[PDB]
């Protein structure tokens, strides 16, 4: 960012300060707020397993068998190839299920068995 | 130009492609109530618990809207069990779907018209947008399957397993569905394809010219922005406290008076979230009621030929093609419109033997000198025969009957 | 009646509502369904029935 | 000191007040041309007067 | 709080009127501009017009 | 404030249930009391009939549908030539098993012989794309000559 020589702070459209000029070094730092989000718990029924996978919504996994996804950071579930139907929804095309020696898996879901007519 | 004996019949038609746009989901959202009201303050959280369940009663509600927006998008688009595909060959009788079928070269496989639609439509205070369960890539794969099923197999993929048909015969069943005889297509097939392909052209230029056409979709995005911008600006309001800034009440006063200055800010920021959640719950119901209509048009319009007047565009409905948009769907309804009418004299019935004759499928007309029977929605005059007419009664019982020769095709054939 | 309260008028006043119902009714009687689909096509009312 | 609530309440009631003219327009204005009946009421015996 | 009550009531009411104007616009499209094969939609009986 | 909240949640809920009771009334009027041509409105398939059953605070429709369940590939043509004039199927489509031509109803394979009673005519074969050549049997020809 290039502030004018007398501007000391920089503001987002929401009137929230998003940059500042270091008063001992006339150059501008971005402020990015400290990372937060929902902690979501993914489970098959307790009539099936007491395994849980945890999704930390909209974090890079750095701030927390660990997967970066467009929904957030998914932990305790293993990424896989085979595209299944959705079982538990997760976001951004990802779903999770409990599958075979059985663990929670995470995958981009299949829409349906393809058919050139 | 009404009279007791005049009818106008169309001598030509125009295949027209109309655009109809519906919103289908909101921006999903969860707000952490406690962080919105009392962000980075345990001293404020200690007071927020005096109000009990309101904090969760609001999170549950916003969860209800967010979980529903993926039901709305599933109901509209996931109306198919199989990802139907077209062949690499494009022998659709002359019908040029290239502008609405996928472009495989782009990293999301949307159509050309879907890129026009995506181009025309556009914080850390507990506020968090959640991604949709279906990415615009998977929404675009469902609309491609619905469209490749429609083109290769007519309505049949909605009823059961897809049963292929030639597209020039599918359009003959369509034409038959609007009460127009199958030969009106096969004799005009290269005209009807050029009318159709011209109409698909006009739609691109209409979409390219302005953003106002997607106004329904843009308004849904605009209202979620206005209600988040308003929810955020209400953090800065005093509500009758000495300040809005929570750390400044937690330093310019001691606890016994800070508790009342904070209850001012909690009572205002809680009235601010109860207002936002109420506005959103009503708004979300306005979009559920639109997603249920888009689902209904996708079933009755795309997956079939609707007979419901003006439900599937102006004119007699032939077929329609679903295209995605950000938070919405677009239907391209193809409709037959009767274009160029001529007046004829007409009569309800005719006399040939004192018994009265009536048209099986159509109406009696005369050019002035000769009487004919023609299909009701297109001028194509048959000479009047015992093959084209049925009988009842006698010529005294009907008001407005006229006399004319009926050809019996069996007479020459018996004499020969 | 003065505490900010106002009733804005409708955009279509009831004469203009009644011209549309006249047009819809006159179209229905003199041309069957054909005025809904395209340019209207006259038919004798007993043939429409 | 209550901030936006006033502006928001005026907007919400404006949003309703505009919508009442969308409703009336979409019900009645389903017709491009104002069709009219002839003076000769020969409707096959049906009396729409 | 007495305006946030009234505007909540009016937003909930206006969506119920919206839902009825959408029915009335659909009846005018399918029932008046056409003939409805949908049973009991356009009054009990076989619908003519 | 806890009542005005509950009563607001309830007024929005009752609007969500009113919108469903108006769908249930429509499904009962249109496809219990009738047969519905609307696609997927009353079950997947082509609609035959439905049977209303009650449930606590609701209704359950048992929609009975015709699902086409086996199929065969045929060759087909939009029309056929015979006397140079072009013949089209009255109800149905033309099909061939690979050696003979038939006319059959579109939604179920039951073939008929091609006849001047199962077809109608317009124009000539120079106007129509994809037309084929086959006999059309006129049931009058034997009935005159015998
Ligand atoms: C379908 O329409 C597209 C254009 O909308 C055709 O593709 C164009 O073909 C012309 C030659 O006629 C080329 O000059 C253009 O560069 C092509 N444009 C694009 C974007 O491909 C296509 O050939 C048409 N197909 C049929 C069967 O008519
Ligand atoms: C009304 O229709 C008849 C039948 O088409 C017209 O008479 C035919 O006219 C053509 C030329 O267009 C001649 O080749 C035929 O020999 C005529 N056939 C018969 C059986 O007369 C007639 O001219 C038309 N009348 C009007 C008022 O246009
Ligand atoms: C249609 O033509 C027939 C003739 O084929 C008319 O019948 C005649 O009517 C007159 C009285 O108007 C009698 O004098 C004749 O004896 C009748 N002849 C026959 C064969 O019936 C009939 O009236 C005409 N109808 C119309 C509506 O013009
Ligand atoms: C249509 O029917 C109405 C009756 O419902 C007719 O009105 C009557 O008209 C006669 C004269 O024709 C008067 O004697 C009566 O006093 C009228 N009654 C009423 C209630 O107005 C009307 O005139 C008929 N119109 C046509 C064109 O036949
Ligand atoms: C196509 O269908 C026709 C009619 O069913 C078949 O021809 C008949 O075959 C039987 C022997 O299996 C003969 O007895 C009949 O006389 C035939 N009828 C005619 C009109 O020729 C024909 O064999 C079928 N083709 C195939 C490829 O199975
Ligand atoms: C519907 C269902 O899944 N029921 C099962 C039941 O059969 C089983 O005995 C029980 C064990 O705790 O868990 C539950
Ligand atoms: C369990 C396993 O072997 N998974 C691999 C996956 O890691 C790889 O990215 C993919 C490439 O197509 O093939 C599969
Ligand atoms: C299709 C056609 O020619 N329609 C004519 C119309 O133009 C004319 O104004 C009217 C006069 O009564 O007669 C009819
Ligand atoms: C119902 C059926 O058997 N359809 C087949 C199809 O599967 C096959 O790929 C094609 C090959 O030409 O012929 C047809
Ligand atoms: C601020 O002080 C540093 C020394 O610590 C000096 O190098 C720098 O040039 C000074 N900047 C200004 C704007 O006076
Ligand atoms: C943050 O996320 C990006 C992917 O968008 C990734 O490249 C990067 O390595 C992540 N940061 C860390 C420190 O892991
Ligand atoms: C019908 O309209 C087309 C243009 O869409 C025109 O080329 C054609 O000549 C017209 N045909 C008749 C029979 O008027
Ligand atoms: C039809 O209208 C004309 C006047 O245009 C009239 O002379 C004739 O008697 C009427 N016929 C019938 C059966 O209504
Ligand atoms: C149908 O398409 C094929 C190409 O797959 C072509 O060879 C054939 O001549 C076409 N026939 C007609 C009637 O268009």
Token readout for B78 is 């996931």
List the single residue in C with minimal CA-CA distance to B364.
C47
Classified as helix, coil or strand, F141 is: helix
- Alpha-carbon span B22 to B216, nearest angstrom: 7
- State whether D21 and C44 contact (CB < 8 Å): no
* Mutational test site, ligand 13, from B1, B2, B3, B5, max ligand atoms within 8 Å of CB: B5
Q: D13 in contact with E at a CB cutoff of 8 Å?
A: yes
Chain E interface, mutation test: which of C36, C39, C45, most E Cβ atoms within 10 Å? C36
Task: State the CB neighbour count (10 A cutoff) for residue B414.
Answer: 10
**Annotated resolution, angstroms:** 3.4
Pairing of strands B29-31, B127-129: antiparallel
Token readout for A98 is 């409990």
Pairing of strands A103-108, B84-85: unpaired
Q: Separation of B3 CA from ligand 13 center, angstroms?
A: 8
- Alpha-carbon span B32 to A37, nearest angstrom: 9
Cα of F65 to nearest chain B Cα, Å:
9
Tell me the torsion sign for CA atoms F52, F54, F58, F60: negative
- Alpha-carbon span F146 to F137, nearest angstrom: 16
10 Å CB burial of residue B31 (0-12, 13-18, 19+) is buried
Partnered with residue B331 across adjacent β-strands are B20, B322
For the CA atoms of C16, B293, B147, B157, the dihedral, rounded to the nearest 10 degrees, stands at -120
Partnered with residue F139 across adjacent β-strands are none
DSSP 8-state class, residue A63? G
Asked whether F131 and F123 are in contact (CB, 8 A), the reply is: no
Rg for chain D, CA atoms, rounded: 22
From atom 1 of ligand 12, which residue's Cα is the shortest distance away? B12
Q: Separation of B93 CA from ligand 14 center, angstroms?
A: 9
Determination approach: cryo-EM
Residue F78: which of F91, F70, F87 has the closest Cα? F87
Asked whether B250 and B43 are in contact (CB, 8 A), the reply is: yes
- Alpha-carbon span E20 to A55, nearest angstrom: 43
Token readout for D13 is 């009631």
Give B-chain residues touching D4 at CB under 8 angstroms.
230, 233-234, 237
A94 Cβ neighbours under 8 A, 6+ residues apart? A69, A70, A71, A74, A106, A107, A108, A109
Cα of B238 to nearest chain D Cα, Å:
5
The answer to whether chain C touches chain E by having 3 or more C-beta pairs less than 8 angstroms apart is yes
Pairing of strands F101-104, F111-113: antiparallel
CA distances from C40 to B25, B318, B338, B340, C31 (A): 38, 20, 9, 11, 6
Q: Is the CB of D45 under 6 A from ligand 13?
A: no
Q: C34 in contact with B at a CB cutoff of 8 Å?
A: yes
From atom 14 of ligand 12, which residue's Cα is the shortest distance away? B12
- Alpha-carbon span B78 to B145, nearest angstrom: 10
Token readout for A94 is 């990802």
Under an 8 Å CB criterion, which residues of B touch A? Answer: 30, 32, 35, 70, 78, 80-87, 123-124, 128, 130-135, 137-138, 141-142, 145, 148-149, 152-153, 162, 164, 229, 232-233, 236
Task: State the CB neighbour count (10 A cutoff) for residue F70.
Answer: 6
Q: F127 in contact with B at a CB cutoff of 8 Å?
A: yes
Query: What per-residue string of b and e applies to F25-37 under the rule 16 or more CB within 10 Å gives b?
Result: eebbbbbbebebb
Rg for chain F, CA atoms, rounded: 26
Rg for chain E, CA atoms, rounded: 16
- Alpha-carbon span B191 to B198, nearest angstrom: 10
Q: What is the largest CA-CA distance in chain A?
A: 70
Neighbour order of strands in the sheet with F132-133: F119-122, F86-89, F80-81, F132-133
Q: D20 in contact with E at a CB cutoff of 8 Å?
A: yes
Q: Measured from the CA of B14, which atom of ligand 12 is nearest?
A: 5
Tell me the torsion sign for CA atoms B196, B200, B206, B209: negative
Residue F114: which of F131, F98, F92, F129 has the closest Cα? F92
Output phi, psi for B302, to 5 deg.
-75, -60
- Alpha-carbon span E25 to E5, nearest angstrom: 30
Partnered with residue A17 across adjacent β-strands are A11
Token readout for F91 is 């109800």
Q: Separation of F129 CA from ligand 14 center, angstroms?
A: 10
Q: D38 in contact with B at a CB cutoff of 8 Å?
A: yes
User: 307-346 in B: which are within 8 Å (CB) of E?
Assistant: 307-311
Q: Separation of B157 CA from ligand 9 center, angstroms?
A: 16
What is the number of CB-based contacts under 8 A between chain E and chain F?
30
Token readout for B251 is 């330093």
Residue F38: which of F71, F16, F17, F63 has the closest Cα? F63
- State whether B1 and C36 contact (CB < 8 Å): no
Report how far Cα B411 is from the mean position of its chain's Cα atoms. 54
Contacts 24+ apart (CB under 8 A), B300-304: B300/F38, B300/F39, B300/F40, B300/F41, B301/B331, B301/B333, B302/B79, B302/B146, B302/B147, B302/B150, B302/B331, B303/B79, B303/B146, B303/B150, B303/B155, B303/B157, B303/B158, B303/F39, B303/F40, B304/B155, B304/B158, B304/F38, B304/F39
- State whether E14 and D16 contact (CB < 8 Å): yes
Classified as helix, coil or strand, A95 is: strand
Tell me the torsion sign for CA atoms F46, F47, F48, F54: positive
Classified as helix, coil or strand, A89 is: strand
Ligand nearest to the CA of B341: 8
- Let me know how long chain A is: 117
Partnered with residue B9 across adjacent β-strands are B342
Q: E20 in contact with B at a CB cutoff of 8 Å?
A: no
Asked whether B356 and B392 are in contact (CB, 8 A), the reply is: yes
Partnered with residue A79 across adjacent β-strands are A106
10 Å CB burial of residue B100 (0-12, 13-18, 19+) is buried
- Alpha-carbon span B147 to B153, nearest angstrom: 10
Ligand 5, residues at Cβ distance < 6 Å: F 97-100
Q: Is the CB of A35 under 6 A from ligand 11?
A: no
Q: C24 in contact with E at a CB cutoff of 8 Å?
A: yes
List the single residue in F with minimal CA-CA distance to B60.
F9
DSSP percent split of chain A into helix, strand, coil, nearest 5: 5, 40, 55
Residue B33: which of B378, B342, B369, B266 has the closest Cα? B266
- Alpha-carbon span B241 to B257, nearest angstrom: 11
Residue F121: which of B50, B187, B192 has the closest Cα? B187
From atom 14 of ligand 14, which residue's Cα is the shortest distance away? F130
Cα of D43 to nearest chain C Cα, Å:
5
Query: What per-residue string of b and e applies to B232-260 under the rule 16 or more CB within 10 Å gives b?
Result: bbbbebbbebeebebeebbeeeeeeebbe
DSSP percent split of chain C into helix, strand, coil, nearest 5: 55, 0, 45
Token readout for B145 is 């399957």
Asked whether B401 and C44 are in contact (CB, 8 A), the reply is: no
Output phi, psi for B331, to 5 deg.
-105, 135
Chain E interface, mutation test: which of D22, D23, D44, most E Cβ atoms within 10 Å? D23
- Measured between its terminal Cα atoms, the distance across chain A in Å is 55
Q: D4 in contact with B at a CB cutoff of 8 Å?
A: yes
Residue B280: which of B2, B61, B9, B56 has the closest Cα? B61
Q: F26 in contact with E at a CB cutoff of 8 Å?
A: yes
What is the number of CB-based contacts under 8 A between chain A and chain B?
79
Residue B319: which of B188, B181, B215, B200 has the closest Cα? B200
- Measured between its terminal Cα atoms, the distance across chain D in Å is 62
Residue B269: which of B227, B237, B229, B224 has the closest Cα? B237
Asked whether A72 and A58 are in contact (CB, 8 A), the reply is: yes
If you search the block for the tokens 């109306």, which residue do you land on? B79
If you search the block for the tokens 């017009």, which residue do you land on? E49
- Let me know how long chain C is: 49
Token readout for A32 is 């990015």
Report how far Cα B63 is from the mean position of its chain's Cα atoms. 27
Q: Measured from the CA of B342, which atom of ligand 8 is nearest?
A: 1
In terms of phi and psi (left: phi > 0; alpha: psi -120 to 50; beta: otherwise), the region of E16 is alpha
Report how far Cα D26 is from the mean position of its chain's Cα atoms. 6
Give D-chain residues touching E49 at CB under 8 angstroms.
none
Per-residue 3-state assignment (H helix, E strand, C coil) for chain B: CCCCCEEEEECCEEEEEEEEEEECCCCCEEECHHHHHHCCCHHHHHHHHHHCCHHHHHHHHHHHHHHHHHHHHHHHHCCCCCCEECCCCCCCCCCCHHHCCECCCCCCCCEHHHHHHHHCCCCCCCEEECCCCCCHHHHHHHHHHHHHHHHHHCCHHHHCCCCCCCHHHHHHHHHHHCCCCCHHHHCCHHHHHHHHHHHHHHHHHHHHHCCHHHHHHHHHHHHHHHHHHHHHHCCCCCCCCCCCCHHHHHHHCCHHHHHHHHHHHHHHHHHHHHHHHHHHHHHHHHHHHHHHHHHHHHHHHHCCCCCCCCCCCCCEEEEEEEEEECCEEEEEEEEEEECCEEEEECCCCEECCCCEEEECCCEEEECCCCEEEECCCCCCCEECECCCEEEECCCCCCCCCEECCCECCHHHHHHC
- Alpha-carbon span B52 to B54, nearest angstrom: 6
Pairing of strands B13-23, B328-338: antiparallel
Q: E38 in contact with F at a CB cutoff of 8 Å?
A: yes
Classified as helix, coil or strand, A8 is: coil
CA distances from E14 to A11, B14, B62, B220, D26 (A): 39, 39, 22, 18, 15
- Alpha-carbon span E46 to A52, nearest angstrom: 59
Among the partner-chain residues A36, A112, A115, the one whose CB lies closest to the CB of B124 is: A36
- Alpha-carbon span D36 to C31, nearest angstrom: 11
- Alpha-carbon span A110 to A94, nearest angstrom: 10
Output phi, psi for B170, to 5 deg.
-55, -50
- Alpha-carbon span D2 to E1, nearest angstrom: 12
If you search the block for the tokens 């806890």, which residue do you land on? F2
Token readout for C29 is 């009687």
Report how far Cα B271 is from the mean position of its chain's Cα atoms. 38
Asked whether C27 and C48 are in contact (CB, 8 A), the reply is: no
Neighbours of chain A (3+ CB pairs under 8 A): B
Residue A99: which of A113, A81, A112 has the closest Cα? A81
Residue D24: which of B290, E28, B282, F12 has the closest Cα? E28
Tell me the torsion sign for CA atoms B2, B7, B8, B13: positive
Q: Is the CB of B91 under 6 A from ligand 14?
A: yes
Task: State the CB neighbour count (10 A cutoff) for residue B305.
Answer: 22
* Mutational test site, ligand 1, from B90, B92, B93, B98, max ligand atoms within 8 Å of CB: B98
Q: Measured from the CA of D47, which atom of ligand 4 is nearest?
A: 1
- Alpha-carbon span F91 to F129, nearest angstrom: 20
Q: Separation of B6 CA from ligand 8 center, angstroms?
A: 10
- Alpha-carbon span B128 to A64, nearest angstrom: 18
Q: Separation of D49 CA from ligand 4 center, angstroms?
A: 8
- Let me know how long chain B is: 416
Output phi, psi for A3, to 5 deg.
-70, 155
- Alpha-carbon span B229 to B276, nearest angstrom: 11
Among the partner-chain residues E4, E11, E25, the one whose CB lies closest to the CB of D16 is: E11
Q: Separation of B346 CA from ligand 3 center, angstroms?
A: 19
Token readout for B99 is 């502008």
Chain F interface, mutation test: which of B187, B272, B307, B414, most F Cβ atoms within 10 Å? B187
Pairing of strands A28-30, A17-21: antiparallel
Asked whether A77 and A104 are in contact (CB, 8 A), the reply is: yes
Contacts 24+ apart (CB under 8 A), F11-17: F11/E9, F11/E12, F12/B281, F12/B282, F12/B285, F12/E12, F15/B285, F15/E12, F15/E15, F15/E16, F16/B285, F16/B288
- Alpha-carbon span E11 to B286, nearest angstrom: 10
Q: Separation of B399 CA from ligand 8 center, angstroms?
A: 24
CA distances from F43 to B237, E37, F66 (A): 53, 18, 10
């Amino acid at each position: 960012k290039k502030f004018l020589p007398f501007q000391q702070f920089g503001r987002d459209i929401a009137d929230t300060t998003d940059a500042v000029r270091d008063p001992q070094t006339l150059e501008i730092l971005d402020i990015t707020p400290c990372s937060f989000g929902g902690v979501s718990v993914i489970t098959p029924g307790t009539n099936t397993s007491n395994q849980v996978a945890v999704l930390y919504q909209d974090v890079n996994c750095t701030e927390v068998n660990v997967f970066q996804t467009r929904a957030g950071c998914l932990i305790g579930a293993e990424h896989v190839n085979n595209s299944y139907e959705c079982d538990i929804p997760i976001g951004a095309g990802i779903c999770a299920s409990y599958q075979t020696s059985q663990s929670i898996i995470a995958y981009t879901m299949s829409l349906g068995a393809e058919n050139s007519v | 130009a009404y009279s007791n004996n005049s009818i106008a019949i169309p001598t030509n038609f125009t295949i027209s492609v109309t655009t109809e746009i519906l919103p289908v989901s909101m921006t999903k959202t969860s707000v952490d109530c406690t962080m919105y009201i009392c962000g980075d303050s345990t001293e404020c959280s200690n007071l927020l618990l005096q109000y009990g369940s309101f904090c969760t009663q609001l999170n549950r509600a916003l969860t209800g809207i967010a979980v529903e927006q993926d039901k709305n998008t599933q109901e509209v688009f996931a109306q198919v069990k199989q990802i139907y595909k077209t062949p690499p060959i494009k022998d659709f009788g002359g019908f040029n779907f290239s502008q609405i079928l996928p472009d495989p070269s782009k990293p999301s496989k949307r159509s050309f018209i879907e890129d026009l639609l995506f181009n025309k439509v556009t914080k850390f205070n507990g506020l968090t947008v959640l991604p949709p369960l279906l990415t615009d890539e998977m929404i675009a794969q469902y609309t491609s399957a619905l469209l490749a099923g429609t083109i290769t197999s007519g309505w049949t993929f909605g009823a059961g397993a897809a049963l292929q048909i030639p597209f020039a015969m599918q359009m003959a069943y369509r034409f038959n569905g609007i009460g127009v005889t199958q030969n009106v297509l096969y004799e005009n097939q290269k005209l009807i394809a050029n009318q159709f392909n011209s109409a698909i052209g006009k739609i691109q230029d209409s979409l390219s010219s302005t953003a106002s056409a997607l106004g329904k979709l843009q308004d849904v995005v605009n209202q979620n922005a206005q209600a988040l911008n308003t929810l955020v600006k209400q953090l800065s309001s005093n509500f009758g406290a000495i300040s809005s800034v929570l750390n400044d009440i937690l330093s310019r006063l001691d606890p016994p008076e800070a508790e009342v200055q904070i209850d001012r800010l909690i009572t205002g920021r809680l009235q601010s979230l109860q207002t936002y959640v109420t506005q959103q719950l009503i708004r979300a119901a306005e979009i559920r009621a639109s997603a249920n209509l888009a689902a209904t048009k996708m079933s009755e319009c795309v997956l079939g030929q609707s007979k419901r007047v003006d439900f599937c565009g102006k004119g007699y409905h032939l077929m329609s093609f679903p295209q995605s948009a950000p938070h919405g769907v677009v239907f391209l309804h193809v409709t037959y419109v009767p274009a160029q009418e001529k007046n004829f004299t007409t009569a309800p019935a005719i006399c040939h033997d004192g018994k009265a004759h009536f048209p099986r499928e159509g109406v009696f007309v005369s050019n002035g000198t000769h009487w004919f029977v023609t299909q009701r929605n297109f001028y194509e005059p048959q000479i009047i025969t015992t093959d084209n007419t049925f009988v009842s009664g006698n010529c005294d019982v009907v008001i407005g009957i006229v006399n004319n020769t009926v050809y019996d095709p069996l007479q020459p054939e018996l004499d020969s």
